[PDB]
Design an enzyme around this catalytic site. Structure first.
Site, PDB file in Angstrom:
ATOM      1  N   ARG A  18     -21.462 -63.010  13.561  1.00 21.62           N
ATOM      2  CA  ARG A  18     -21.098 -62.940  14.984  1.00 21.62           C
ATOM      3  C   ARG A  18     -21.564 -64.194  15.683  1.00 21.62           C
ATOM      4  O   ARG A  18     -22.548 -64.796  15.309  1.00 21.62           O
ATOM      5  CB  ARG A  18     -21.703 -61.701  15.610  1.00 21.62           C
ATOM      6  CG  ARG A  18     -23.156 -61.539  15.158  1.00 21.62           C
ATOM      7  CD  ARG A  18     -23.526 -60.054  15.150  1.00 21.62           C
ATOM      8  NE  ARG A  18     -24.026 -59.657  16.497  1.00 21.62           N
ATOM      9  CZ  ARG A  18     -25.255 -59.929  16.843  1.00 21.62           C
ATOM     10  NH1 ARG A  18     -26.230 -59.739  15.996  1.00 21.62           N
ATOM     11  NH2 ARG A  18     -25.510 -60.388  18.037  1.00 21.62           N
ATOM     12  N   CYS A  19     -20.868 -64.599  16.686  1.00 24.22           N
ATOM     13  CA  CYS A  19     -21.269 -65.841  17.395  1.00 24.22           C
ATOM     14  C   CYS A  19     -22.767 -65.789  17.664  1.00 24.22           C
ATOM     15  O   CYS A  19     -23.298 -64.745  17.986  1.00 24.22           O
ATOM     16  CB  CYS A  19     -20.505 -65.945  18.713  1.00 24.22           C
ATOM     17  SG  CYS A  19     -21.258 -67.208  19.772  1.00 24.22           S
ATOM     18  N   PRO A  20     -23.408 -66.921  17.536  1.00 22.72           N
ATOM     19  CA  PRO A  20     -22.774 -68.204  17.146  1.00 22.72           C
ATOM     20  C   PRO A  20     -22.757 -68.382  15.615  1.00 22.72           C
ATOM     21  O   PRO A  20     -22.416 -69.429  15.116  1.00 22.72           O
ATOM     22  CB  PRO A  20     -23.724 -69.244  17.733  1.00 22.72           C
ATOM     23  CG  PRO A  20     -25.103 -68.546  17.857  1.00 22.72           C
ATOM     24  CD  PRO A  20     -24.848 -67.031  17.808  1.00 22.72           C
TER      25      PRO A  20
END
Length: 81
Positions: A18-20
């Site tokens: 998941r970001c980042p």
């Protein structure tokens, strides 16, 4: 519609990323990638379809082929600038 996800030069798992983190893998891969190459990327995280690619576009890379037919998403990205 031609298949642009052919055997890519690199890959990026982003399923569970998941970001980042995902956008991050494309970064280091982008640092080890070359202009005129390709990188396939999968992502089940909902923030990767928007951040992973939104990232390649910001560094002058190209989204060769997107995949949103149902998680996990996928997006090819020809490294370049």
């Amino acid at each position: 519609m031609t298949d642009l996800f052919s055997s890519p030069d690199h890959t990026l798992d982003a399923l569970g990323l998941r970001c980042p983190e995902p956008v991050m893998m494309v970064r280091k891969t982008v640092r080890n990638m070359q202009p005129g190459e390709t990188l396939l990327i999968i992502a089940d995280d909902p923030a990767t379809t928007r951040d992973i690619p939104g990232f390649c576009t910001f560094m002058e890379h190209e989204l060769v082929a997107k995949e949103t037919d149902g998680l996990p998403y996928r997006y090819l990205i020809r490294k370049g600038g």
